Each structure stands twice: as structure tokens, then as C-alpha cells.
Amino acid sequence: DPDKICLGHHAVANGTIVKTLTNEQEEVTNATETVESTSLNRLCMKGRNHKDLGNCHPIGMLIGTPACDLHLTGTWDTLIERKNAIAYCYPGATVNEEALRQKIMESGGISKINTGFTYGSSINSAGTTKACMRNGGNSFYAELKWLVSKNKGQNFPQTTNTYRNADTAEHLIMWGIHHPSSTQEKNDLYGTQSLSISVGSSTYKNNFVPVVGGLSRIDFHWTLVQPGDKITFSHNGGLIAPSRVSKLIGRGLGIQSEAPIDNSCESKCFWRGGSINTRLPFQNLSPRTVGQCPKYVNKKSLMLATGMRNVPE
């Protein structure tokens, strides 16, 4: 008989099923996953000058709610927002609220500048309330002033206050309009006269009238004051005037999540549930992610073959 030499390949007992162009059920010797299905339930903030707001809502940084007392000023590359965050201590809401929140979450810091508004002896600029509690006693929004008459029942005087932007970058200015609950409440603070607030700059002009209808509410408005421009507030009661304006510094990564901070680990991809630190190209946790992320796909698994056809004995 002749001597033999045989060519052959390896194989395994337990193969793995992969998809090819021509076969949905192709057995190979090994394969590896390309779609990540697991996430870390933490915000991995190592190597990031970050700011967890916690109970503070981004809009509360600009107006100065008691919850945001440690977040009036600062710089950051990453800003974390939480669920059920307090923007307003007193009842009310901001006009064009979502656009303001988005602009703050894109920023890389906030700095404050004084308006320098001074009010006459007739006006009481230290108006307070039990809704906004600070340091045990009653207080108000830190960056605003509730203006009322010093003598109860007297007419609030025709006041004019003009902020001037001396900076080379634009400034964000916010104010409030008190809409009293009753006519008796309206007359005690601002008097019997008809109220009318005018706000005017070179790129903005608007009138605001209080409307009478157990607390009241203070609705907020905002605009951008350009470099070398001024904004004039003419009023006679009802205006919650700014003592300071805001300046949004640079850019940063806004994150909205419920996961706790972790400073020991790094990450470049975040979502509502936490961080995604995978090396894989695809992922199926959520379609809403931020940062440098793997791409979202509608797939549980996609196995990439790392071996030949498994042809077992």
C-alpha cells in the first residue's frame, strides 16, 4: 500500500451561528459581538471639570433660586441636569422656557454682572416671600428684586432703569412680571393707577401689563443684550427687575440623566441611564445619546465571524 499525507483544518464541538450574504444559519468556529447591549449605571466624570446641579434647574442659575445658591457662577466642560429640578420657588413660568434651558446646557460656564439699578425712597426693593426660603427666614430670587411701594396703598412712582452692555460679548437679561391674585392685593403693593411696563433695546421692544386674577404668580421673560447696546425698563409697579445679568461662557456638554457621579472612571458617551464605555461600533440601549457614541441600531445582536466554517466530526 502507499503512504499517505492528509491536509485538514481545525474544528470545535460547540460552534457559533452567524449571518452571511447567502445564509442566515451559518456555523463558524468563533464569532464576536458588534452591538453593545449593556451600560454602566453611573456618570463617569474622570478628566472632566463637571458640575452636577442636583436639585437645581438650569434656569434657576440665571434668576437665583435657593436650590441654585452654589450654581450662580462657575466654569465647566460638562453640565448635568436632573429630573424634577426646581427652577421656580415662587409660582410662575418663563416665556420661551425650552430655548433658554437648551442655551444654558450648551454653555461652558456662567458669570454675573451687576445692572447697577438704584431705586428711590418711595420704592421698597427688598420684597420677599415664604415660597423662596433662604437661611431660615423668608427671601427672594437672588438675581432679581421684587419692587413694591414703601407705603401700603400708595402709587408706585414712574421709574426708569437702563442697563448698558460694556462687554465685547452679548449678555442674557431676565425679568419678571407679577400678575396679582386680587385687586386688593394689587392696590396694596402698586396703588390704584393703571400699570404698564415697557422693555426696549435696539433689537427688542415689548409692553407688559399685569392682569388681576393663596399665592399669586410671577411670569419671566428674557432677551439678549448685544455689545455696546442698552436695554431700558420703564415701569410703575409689577416689574420684578434684574439686579444682575448673565453671560454664557464658551461651550460644554449638556447631559440629562438620573445616574450618580463616579470620578474614578472615564467616558465619552452618555445617556439617561448612565455611561457607555464599549469599544464596539454599534449599540441598542437608547437612540438618545450625547458625546462620542456608538451608533444606535434596531438589533439585539450582530455576530462578526472570527473563524472558518465549523465542520465537526
Binding site: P2, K4, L7, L21, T34, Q256, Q292, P294, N310
Partner: protein, 172 residues
């Protein structure tokens, strides 16, 4: 498959070969043996390593939030965002399925080709001293000891030394 060796004329793989992807099995007067081929094994592994280096990665593009997790968004722009995100997700899901299906097809046929190239290399070494049996083996028509078998595996088998013995055995 494409090159006809793996899951083809070679009937099955060897589970006993755990030190390589491709290899030899001989039979002579001295006995039987097994040995893996290093060159063809690494050629297949290096190509699969190249696929993993290219495929297992993400882009460096910084994406910011355009949808609020905790509050409402404007209705018109929210619909446009939903349409756009779903369109982009259909593209990436389609791309990921095509990528993996195409790469798996190539990996399988690449591995098949390396088997065939080892088989064809051995056929040409042996020249007129052996014949193919159709199952991936060569029936050698001369006495081939363990040193002779090692020279076939190491690509130092000189056919002209065994040619005269082989042509006599083949023709009768």
C-alpha cells in the same frame, strides 16, 4: 464554498488539532502523526485581526442633545427630529447588517482559500511522486519516513530523489 476545500472535498475538520488552524496528518511504516502549519494559520489570523481593527471602532464626532429627557419640546420640530432620527437609525441598522453579512462571507471564503493554497503547495512539491485521493490526501508512491514527511511539511522535499521509485510503483 467558493474555493471548494473547507466544507467541500475535505469532508470534515479535526477537533484534535488545537495548536493551529490548518495542518497535516501522515501515515507511514513508522506510524501516524499530526502537525499544524504555522504560515497558513497566521495568514488567516492576521487577516481576521485586520477586520477587527477596522470594524471595532466608533467615530470621534461630538453629538449634543436635540431632545429633552425631562421636559416637552415644540411639536413641529419634534416630529422632524423623530423622522430624521428614525431615518438615520434605519440607515445604520441596514449598514451594520450588510457590513457583518459581507465580512462574514469574506472571512469564511478567505479561510477556505488558505486551505486550498496549502493543498496546492503540497501537490506541486510532490510533483509526479504522488496522486490525489479526492478527500484532501495525497497517496505517496514511495517509502516516506518521518524525516521525509517533515521535509514535505517544511517545504524542503526534493521530488527528484524519490522520482525513480515512484514512477515504477505508479505504472505497476
Amino acid at each position: 464554498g467558493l474555493f471548494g476545500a473547507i466544507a467541500g472535498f475535505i469532508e470534515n475538520g479535526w477537533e484534535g488539532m488545537v495548536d493551529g488552524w490548518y495542518g497535516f496528518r501522515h501515515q507511514n511504516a513508522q506510524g501516524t502523526g499530526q502537525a499544524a502549519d504555522y504560515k497558513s494559520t497566521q495568514a488567516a489570523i492576521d487577516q481576521i485581526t485586520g477586520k477587527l481593527n477596522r470594524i471595532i471602532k466608533k467615530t470621534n464626532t461630538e453629538f449634543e442633545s436635540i431632545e429633552s429627557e425631562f421636559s416637552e419640546i415644540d411639536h413641529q420640530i419634534g416630529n422632524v427630529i423623530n423622522w430624521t432620527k428614525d431615518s438615520i437609525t434605519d440607515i445604520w441598522t441596514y449598514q451594520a447588517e450588510l457590513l457583518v453579512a459581507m465580512e462574514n462571507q469574506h472571512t469564511i471564503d478567505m479561510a477556505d482559500s488558505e486551505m486550498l493554497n496549502l493543498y496546492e503547495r503540497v501537490r506541486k512539491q510532490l510533483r509526479q511522486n504522488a496522486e490525489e485521493d479526492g478527500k484532501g490526501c495525497f497517496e505517496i508512491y514511495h517509502a516516506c519516513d518521518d524525516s521525509c514527511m517533515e521535509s514535505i511539511r517544511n517545504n524542503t522535499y526534493d521530488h527528484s530523489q524519490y522520482r525513480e521509485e515512484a514512477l515504477l510503483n505508479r505504472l505497476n
